[PDB]
């Protein structure tokens, strides 16, 4: 099922969608435009959206660092369930709370 995955959306559309339809903590995954094969997480937080690159090497998935997973759903679920593990440089967590359905 993977309801949080939006196959046909760009980053600017993801942004607008999270701002209109979501709450802070709402997030979604989409295909990368910047790198075909990869994915991107788009996450609403404090009324704005941050985007996070997801590496698909073919073997495994990760966030260009951090722990590696066999599938996209494993990566997303892991970061939904380990909130301290996803943080920017400044120390703020990027919280994947509420999957925004397509």
């Amino acid at each position: 099922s993977r309801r949080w995955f939006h196959p046909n959306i760009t980053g600017v559309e993801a942004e607008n969608l999270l701002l209109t339809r979501g709450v802070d903590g709402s997030f979604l995954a989409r295909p990368s435009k910047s790198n075909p094969g990869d994915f991107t997480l788009s996450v609403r937080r404090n009324g704005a959206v941050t985007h996070i690159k997801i590496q698909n090497t073919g073997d495994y998935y990760d966030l260009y660092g951090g722990e590696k997973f066999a599938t996209l759903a494993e990566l997303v679920q892991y970061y939904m369930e380990h909130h301290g593990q996803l943080k920017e440089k400044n120390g703020d967590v990027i919280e994947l709370k509420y999957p925004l359905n397509c």
């Binding site: 959206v49 690159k53 260009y64 951090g66 593990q85 920017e88 440089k89």
Partner: peptide
Amino acid sequence: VDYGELDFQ
């Protein structure tokens, strides 16, 4: 957009 930089463990 805007791609955030991550701190791992």
